[PDB]
Design a protein around this ligand. Structure first.
Ligand SMILES: Nc1ncnc2c1ncn2[C@@H]1O[C@H](COP(=O)(O)OP(=O)(O)O)[C@@H](O)[C@H]1O
Lengths: 374, 94, 294, 280
């Protein structure tokens, strides 16, 4: 407590954040990538590792095959996650894992074996004293100052909407949808090939992601905006590539995020995000509908596109009943909020009963996490 | 068919469905109408002759197409050829 | 999971599936353990039972909008009858939405809803409540078959063993004037000292019971016997074409975890309604339908 | 897997030419279609409910031909004239037929105090229409209906003289018309009163059919005398709000405005560290 602070480690699908509990800012945020060399190294004395992890891997993008250990919110390479956790504990923070508790976040709906494997890895090798698993979407509402409301989360893995009612996650009304930032980046490639610019390797995917981050916005009205873009060239902007070339994105700036609202562009038969949130509220009982319409919180990396707030408000107004209290509450720091909620939750004195001791794990195997943490 | 049932014949599927639907709605008219009607008393009759004398789909096509629109909303996946694919037009140029 | 938000409707009678889809959302056991300075365990349990009875009455179609009322007794030391507030539909009724009023109609508990109760509609129940200290549940129902049975001169006929199980039937003629206190006196006269089933002519069918299960049993038997009579008295056309069962001979020959005489149907339909997802919280006589696997 | 369609399509349309109170009447008659579809009375479009928008401008709203009552929405309604000319067409790519409006047109020419006319073709009401002495008030609901007028119907009213006989047989003050062998027509100043009377007369007809079947004669029944039978809420105001509220709870986007709030909405438990809400 006083002597040692619990480690708050947020394992997002695209980025990984780490810091100490009770602190405002995470100490280290880095991409969750692992790269392996693809070319023969002929310089004898310059020093080449077998694999590069994190920011060191992203510095040398040209000579590596970048691989993501987390795929669609599901871990597909567990020793790769051992590497990313080793890099987090030893290099970024320079603290031993055996002397501090750790806090882990997770998707609202994950397989049981995934939780068991995380617990087994965290106790067996790192020998951490105490650990706890929390739902990613719950901690955002704690960071919001709220205990009742609907939380929409969208990262690089998957986009899900949950309702929370005085700290209770309703399991039936949690809805999932496969519209993440990675799919938007792939669609950005697919629409960039029209102008004449071709990107094909995993190195250029980071360039396309940076283009998506820096030059995109959400149209309030799609049909008017297409006519506006066809009429004039005032919407066009120029981006300057790492090799010195200059591209003109032009029309596609409001075509990249539009796959969120109309998933038929990507070939998916599912409904839009607004319909997903509307159906998520529709599945709950009547009594809590009024405080779900009157209380909506946006979170996640994808939700920082400019103009997403007004478009979201209009699209959820179009589906809501008449004279209904509708408001969207989007904090400016909405994709650092999960770490903030984790540090807040670890800061409390009544939270210290949540910790799982080493003796408890040694007695009850890796299956104790589900009984101890509901 | 006396004491057996009802048969409707038609040139097309929609017309035959029209005829059989008119016949069955006639029979649940007649069954609950004729209950208190004893003989010529307690009855109102219409002369067939002077009442009969009184795109562009024919009889039953509107009928059967509306029922197919009802069925396709249940996920039946019928593939009936609709003259009009949607009730609303496509959105304008804006 | 994998279930539509609203249930697809039948070619006829969309009210059944529609109220099913509404009951999927709204639980009838609205109470979850909040503060209740006036509630009792028996009062809360009877509130849940009454809400479930309202939803069951809506589910069979034994309802004519909101113009029928069902009242129960809290069995406190003074008055306190529970009634639906005036205005809410039967599929909207929850446990906390029910309104406790007095015998003359004064609202002692306004409930969870702003809608007041109908003052005129409670006098018919108040006449029965003042008539008998034994009665505890009064159900007023309107089915078309029952209205057709009430509209004929002869009334109910002993043609089924279920009508014989009904026993003596009190008949109340349609005054249509609502003359208040003497109307109450005439109800007391026609109902008599002991009776199970009342038929208020040309308007409705009334069942009175010491419990909810008893009233449900009586009204179910009455409705089914009425719709038995509808077809056969139509086809007969006279006494020369109808066999009448002898009441006395049939009744003489025919006659804790243990069930009452009317708890079986109530518990079976409560099992059905909880399998639907209404989560009524009714105390079952046996918690499981079958033995647990070994 | 669902029939559910949002009954309010006024915001997505953002077009057409509307009156100052038209967009509420459109939603109200669309809801009337939804209720008559849900009870199983009608499924196939035969121009059942007609509403007058304004006393002076006429421009009566009707359903398009070909769209079943389940699929009718607010924007799909068609504003026609008294003769049958198209005043305004909504977003409905269907051929326009105003033949069924002719039944309501002379009633519009006869009584102005009516705005809503509801025509039925249910088997019970059509059997009562073929029932030669008409509705016998042997039940409470038939007493609640009121007075009736009976009119012979030959199936056509394009003729100039048939209109005179129709408005002669309707009378100065009578809000229920019974056409022989052609079902029933109900007449109301508001859609609420007309819908209430439709429901009550349908229930009375359903009672009467079973009664005439079971009794086998008039003498086996009892008939109470019409002379013996002989804040403020309007005739259909109270029930129709409950129906709209229940459809809102299911999820139909009913645009009907509620005169009084449902729930008290006790103030929830507030924290100061809230981010201030809304997107402004
Ligand atoms: N400033 C920004 N502008 C636009 N998009 C951003 C911005 N920052 C992050 N993103 C998008 O968010 C994604 C990262 O989401 P992240 O918050 O890491 O997900 P998780 O919740 O799994 O941690 C990236 O793919 C990126 O496209």
């Amino acid at each position: 407590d006083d002597d040692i602070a619990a480690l708050v480690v947020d394992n997002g699908s695209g980025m990984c954040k780490a810091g100490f509990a009770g602190d405002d800012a995470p100490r280290a945020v880095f991409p969750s990538i692992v790269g392996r060399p693809r070319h023969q190294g002929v310089m004898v004395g310059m020093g080449q590792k077998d694999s590069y992890v994190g920011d060191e891997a992203q510095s040398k993008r040209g000579i590596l095959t970048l691989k993501y250990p987390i795929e669609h919110g599901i871990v597909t390479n567990w020793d790769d996650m051992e590497k990313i956790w080793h890099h987090t504990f030893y290099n970024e923070l320079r603290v031993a894992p055996e002397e501090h508790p750790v806090l882990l976040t997770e998707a609202p709906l994950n397989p049981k074996a995934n939780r068991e494997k995380m617990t087994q890895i965290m106790f067996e090798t790192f020998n951490t004293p105490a650990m706890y698993v929390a739902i990613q979407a719950v901690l955002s509402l704690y960071a919001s100052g709220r205990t009742t409301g609907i939380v929409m989360d969208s990262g690089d893995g998957v986009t899900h909407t949950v309702p929370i009612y005085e700290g209770y996650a309703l399991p039936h009304a949690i809805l999932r949808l496969d519209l993440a930032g990675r799919d938007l980046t792939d669609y950005l490639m697919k629409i960039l090939t029209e102008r004449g610019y071709s990107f094909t390797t995993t190195a250029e995917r980071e360039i396309v992601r940076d283009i998506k981050e820096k030059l995109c916005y959400v149209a309030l009205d799609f049909e008017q905006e297409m006519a506006t873009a066809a009429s004039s060239s005032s919407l066009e902007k120029s981006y300057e590539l790492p090799d010195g070339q200059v591209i003109t994105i032009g029309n596609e700036r409001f075509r990249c995020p539009e796959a969120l609202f109309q998933p038929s562009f990507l070939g998916m038969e599912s409904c839009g995000i607004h319909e997903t949130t509307f159906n998520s509220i529709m599945k709950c009982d009547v009594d809590i509908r009024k405080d779900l319409y009157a209380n909506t919180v946006l979170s996640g990396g994808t939700t920082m596109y400019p103009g997403i707030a007004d478009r979201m408000q209009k699209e959820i107004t179009a589906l809501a009943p008449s004279t209904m209290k509708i408001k969207i509450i989007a904090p400016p720091e909405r994709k650092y909020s999960v770490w903030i909620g984790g540090s807040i939750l670890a800061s409390l004195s009544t939270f210290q009963q949540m910790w799982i001791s080493k003796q408890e794990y040694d007695e009850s195997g890796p299956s104790i996490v589900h009984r101890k943490c509901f | 068919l006396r004491n057996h049932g009802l048969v409707s014949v038609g040139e097309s599927v929609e017309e035959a469905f029209y005829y059989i639907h008119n016949l069955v709605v006639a029979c649940e008219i007649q069954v609950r109408t004729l209950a208190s009607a004893g003989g010529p008393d307690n009855l109102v009759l219409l002369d067939p002759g002077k009442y009969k004398a009184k795109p562009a789909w024919q009889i039953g096509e509107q009928e059967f197409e509306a029922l197919m629109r009802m069925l396709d909303n249940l996920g039946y996946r019928t593939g009936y050829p609709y003259r009009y694919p949607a009730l609303r037009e496509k959105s304008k140029k804006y | 999971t994998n279930v539509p938000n609203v249930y697809p409707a039948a070619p006829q009678g969309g009210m059944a599936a529609l109220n099913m889809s509404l009951g999927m959302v709204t639980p009838v056991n609205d109470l979850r353990g909040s503060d209740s300075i006036a509630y009792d365990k028996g009062e809360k349990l009877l509130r849940c039972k009454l809400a479930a009875l309202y939803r069951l009455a809506d589910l069979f179609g034994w309802s004519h909008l909101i113009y029928n009322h069902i009242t129960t007794r809290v069995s406190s030391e003074q008055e306190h009858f529970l009634i639906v507030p005036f205005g809410l539909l039967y599929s909207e009724v929850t446990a906390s939405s029910l309104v406790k009023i007095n015998l003359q109609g004064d609202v002692v508990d306004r409930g969870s809803t702003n809608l007041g109760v109908n003052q005129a509609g409670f006098t018919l129940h108040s006449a029965v409540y003042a008539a008998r200290p034994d009665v505890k549940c009064v159900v007023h129902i309107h089915t078309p078959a029952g209205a057709a049975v009430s509209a004929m001169k002869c009334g109910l006929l002993p043609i089924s063993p279920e009508a014989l199980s009904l026993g003596e039937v009190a008949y109340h003629d349609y005054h249509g004037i609502l003359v208040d206190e003497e109307e109450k006196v005439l109800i007391q006269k026609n109902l008599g000292p002991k009776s199970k089933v009342l038929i208020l002519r040309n308007h409705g069918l009334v069942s009175v019971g010491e419990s909810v299960e008893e009233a449900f049993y009586y009204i179910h038997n009455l409705v089914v016997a009425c719709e038995i009579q509808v077809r056969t008295l139509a086809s007969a056309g006279g006494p020369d074409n109808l066999v009448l069962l002898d009441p006395g001979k049939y009744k003489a020959k025919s006659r804790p975890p243990a069930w009452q005489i009317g708890e079986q149907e109530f518990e079976a339909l409560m099992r059905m309604l909880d399998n639907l997802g209404y989560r009524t919280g009714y105390p079952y006589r046996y918690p499981a339908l079958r033995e647990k696997s070994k | 897997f669902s029939m559910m369609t949002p009954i309010n399509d006024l915001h997505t349309a953002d077009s057409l030419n509307l009156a100052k109170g038209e967009r509420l009447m459109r939603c109200k008659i669309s809801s009337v279609y939804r209720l008559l579809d849900l009870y199983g009375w009608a499924q196939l479009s035969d121009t059942y409910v007609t509403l007058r928008v304004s006393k002076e401008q006429d421009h009566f709203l009707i359903s398009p031909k070909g769209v079943s009552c389940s699929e009718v929405t607010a924007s799909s309604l068609i504003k026609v004239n008294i003769l049958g000319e198209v005043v305004e067409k909504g977003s409905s790519c269907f051929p326009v037929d105003t033949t069924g409006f002719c039944l309501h047109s002379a009633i519009y020419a006869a009584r102005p105090d009516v705005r809503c006319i509801i025509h039925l073709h249910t088997p019970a009401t059509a059997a009562v229409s073929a029932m030669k002495w008409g509705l016998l008030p042997v039940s409470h609901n038939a007493l609640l209906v009121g007075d009736m007028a009976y009119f012979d119907f030959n199936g056509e009213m394009e003729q100039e003289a048939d209109r005179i006989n129709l408005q002669k047989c309707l009378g100065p003050t009578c809000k229920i018309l019974v056409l022989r062998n052609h079902g029933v027509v109900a007449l109301g100043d508001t859609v609420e009163e007309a819908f209430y009377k439709v429901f009550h007369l349908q229930a009375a007809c359903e009672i009467q059919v079973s009664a005439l079947s079971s009794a086998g004669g008039v003498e086996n029944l009892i008939l109470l005398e019409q002379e013996k039978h002989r804040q403020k809420s309007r005739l259909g105001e109270h029930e129709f709000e409950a129906l709209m509220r229940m459809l809102d709870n299911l999820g139909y986007r009913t645009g009907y405005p509620y005169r009084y709030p449902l729930v008290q909405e006790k103030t929830k438990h507030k924290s100061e560290v809230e981010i201030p809400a809304t997107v402004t």
